[PDB]
Amino acid sequence: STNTFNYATYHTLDEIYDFMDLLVAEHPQLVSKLQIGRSYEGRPIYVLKFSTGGSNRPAIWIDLGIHSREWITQATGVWFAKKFTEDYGQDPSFTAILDSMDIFLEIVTNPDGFAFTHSQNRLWRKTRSVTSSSLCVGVDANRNWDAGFGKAGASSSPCSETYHGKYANSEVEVKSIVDFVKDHGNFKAFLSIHSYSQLLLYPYGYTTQSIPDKTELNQVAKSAVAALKSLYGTSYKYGSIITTIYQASGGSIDWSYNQGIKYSFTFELRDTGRYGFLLPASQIIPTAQETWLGVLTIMEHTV
Ligand SMILES: [Zn+2]
């Protein structure tokens, strides 16, 4: 059961998918599992929908693990999923959130890369799409979105870790989210979880022009990182993608903000580079916990 599940260790693709089935079984009135597409290599892409009803309620999107090696994110997603089911009807603010909003949680946004990080290459980041006329595989899925696509901040070299693919939304993992979000039509927040560097970022990555909503999103980020910090003292920086970590094109929150999803943020979780992507399992739960406060803080500014 999800009560027996070990949240303080890293899991396989199958173990996470299994976790999802266990959670849906234990909480049929709160969580359901949607398949929004398949991965390049044919794995199902699963989004957990947390909802107390209504129809097409204003929604919060959270993608984790779009970069497969950032294992702290998938691990955080699993923890989040469990916590949603624990806190509804217990926590005032979260109960409040779930009463008015749906949450869509994609724990493994890049299943093919995730399996590859377990079977072949722990540090694999990209999808696993086959590039015609190349010896290399995979696209940086967070450079595949239709926001400044192909512009500086991503690579046209197929062997590059930042290769953006042949055209925006070329990756099924990405098109799947796009089609889902577009069809849903009522997303108010869109959260992309990554590691590492301890950043909370708002758009844009692809351009120096400030977003109209900068003052608000900046305050929200400031609030979020402060809430996150209160737990363990973890220090995050926040700002636009391009002023905080330089130009990046084809990014997810740049796309979503441009769809009118105002509350678009990207988290870069622990740490700052000591362990990097190989963050120790013993940090999974504390990271999850502090990140939760930050996320919850953002959801509150959305309701
Ligand atoms: Zn990443």
UniProtKB/TrEMBL annotation:
Catalytically driven reaction(s): Release of a C-terminal amino acid, but little or no action with -Asp, -Glu, -Arg, -Lys or -Pro; leukotriene C4 + H2O = leukotriene F4 + glycine
Binding residue positions for Zn(2+): 67, 70, 194
Cofactor: Zn(2+)
Catalytic residue positions: 268
Plastid listed as a keyword: no
Domain Peptidase M14: 9-302
Record's subcellular location: Secreted
EC category: hydrolase
Similarity comment: Belongs to the peptidase M14 family.
Subunit structure: Monomer. May form a complex with proelastase 2.
Function: Carboxypeptidase that catalyzes the release of a C-terminal amino acid, but has little or no action with -Asp, -Glu, -Arg, -Lys or -Pro. Catalyzes the conversion of leukotriene C4 to leukotriene F4 via the hydrolysis of an amide bond.
Protein's name according to its UniProt entry: Carboxypeptidase A1
Species per Swiss-Prot/TrEMBL record: Bos taurus
Higher taxonomy: Eukaryota, Metazoa, Chordata, Craniata, Vertebrata
